[PDB]
Amino acid sequence: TEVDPTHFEKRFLKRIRDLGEGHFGKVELCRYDPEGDNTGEQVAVKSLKPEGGNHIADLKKEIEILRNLYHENIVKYKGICTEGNGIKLIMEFLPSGSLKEYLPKNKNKINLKQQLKYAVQICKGMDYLGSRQYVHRDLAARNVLVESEHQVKIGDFGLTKAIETDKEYYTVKDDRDSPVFWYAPECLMQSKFYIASDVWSFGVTLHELLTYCDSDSSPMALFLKMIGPTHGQMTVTRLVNTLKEGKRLPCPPNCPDEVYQLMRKCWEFQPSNRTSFQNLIEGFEALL
Numbered sequence: 001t002e003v004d005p006t007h008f009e010k011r012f013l014k015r016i017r018d019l020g021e022g023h024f025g026k027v028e029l030c031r032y033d034p035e036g037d038n039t040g041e042q043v044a045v046k047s048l049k050p051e052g053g054n055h056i057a058d059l060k061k062e063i064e065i066l067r068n069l070y071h072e073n074i075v076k077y078k079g080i081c082t083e084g085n086g087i088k089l090i091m092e093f094l095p096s097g098s099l100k101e102y103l104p105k106n107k108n109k110i111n112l113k114q115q116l117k118y119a120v121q122i123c124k125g126m127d128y129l130g131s132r133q134y135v136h137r138d139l140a141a142r143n144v145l146v147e148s149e150h151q152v153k154i155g156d157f158g159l160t161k162a163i164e165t166d167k168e169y170y171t172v173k174d175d176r177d178s179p180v181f182w183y184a185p186e187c188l189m190q191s192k193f194y195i196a197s198d199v200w201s202f203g204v205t206l207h208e209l210l211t212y213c214d215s216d217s218s219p220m221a222l223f224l225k226m227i228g229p230t231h232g233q234m235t236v237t238r239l240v241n242t243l244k245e246g247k248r249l250p251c252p253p254n255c256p257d258e259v260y261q262l263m264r265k266c267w268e269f270q271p272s273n274r275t276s277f278q279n280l281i282e283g284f285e286a287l288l
């Protein structure tokens with residue numbers, strides 16, 4: 001019987017270091033080394049922490065979603081490592097990290113033209129996801145991985161949900177660890193997620209890209225300056241209230257008004273009023 005190239009044996013999967021931690025999950029840099037001499041390929045490995053059953057089903061749904069996504073700007077699925085009753089998502093490793101790590105260290109190499117090129121590639125991966133009736137729900141610069149200085153990829157689908165054929169949105173129940181400072185008003189207010197909700201999260205991701213992911217100008221850092229940083233449980237309702245008053249993230253420094261106006265179109269209060277990923281692409285390619 002033939003060997004499956006998507007089947008990764010646990011014995012040959014050697015953990016190097018953690019890359020990130022999330023919603024009851026974690027991503028590690030592992031070396032798949034069947035020959036045991038350290039020549040095997042580096043891979044990014046997503047697994048669940050030992051300490052919920054429903055979290056396993058979510059991961060299995062995430063694996064199945066990524067397995068069937070094929071786009072230049074979507075991180076490549078490599079395989080799975082099964083236990084079964086336990087599973088690991090095996091993906092390609094992108095040594096440049098996400099925009100959060102790469103942009104502060106490479107500002108000199110990355111001018112506005114290259115930022116608008118990344119914005120285009122983020123919209124292209126996002127539009128492909130949207131065309132397959134999926135809502136990403138976690139579009140942030142920490143999830144935009146750097147392939148090269150000319151290429152970015154949407155690198156994590158941990159919150160990705162299918163929209164039903166008859167529906168315009170998906171209703172979420174597991175709300176706890178929501179990236180609220182990236183979320184559209186309908187997401188914060190009603191737990192409803194539209195493709196237009198990802199367009200809102202794209203506007204925030206774009207803002208981060210234009211600010212080269214500087215920690216001090218981050219969407220959380222700026223929103224907490226607007227609303228206040230000592231509200232605790234009341235932060236989300238104070239965030240809903242400022243967005244209702246028309247307050248939006250300011251213009252990144254050195255970002256021309258034309259780029260800012262495309263970003264502002266991602267931030268129309270009503271989801272139906274927001275620009276689409278295809279229109280953003282036209283606007284970015286017109287500026288290039």
Ligand SMILES: COc1nn(C)cc1Nc1ncc(C)c(-c2c[nH]c3c(NC(=O)c4cccnc4C)cccc23)n1
Binds near residue numbers: 019098155
């Ligand atoms: C050294 O390069 C590197 N630095 N970082 C920081 C990353 C990479 N590279 C890399 N290459 C390929 C891949 C596929 C990734 C990568 C994919 N998802 C990652 C997460 N996600 C979460 O932790 C998360 C998010 C949402 C929901 N649940 C969870 C568990 C973190 C860090 C990394 C990745 N990362």
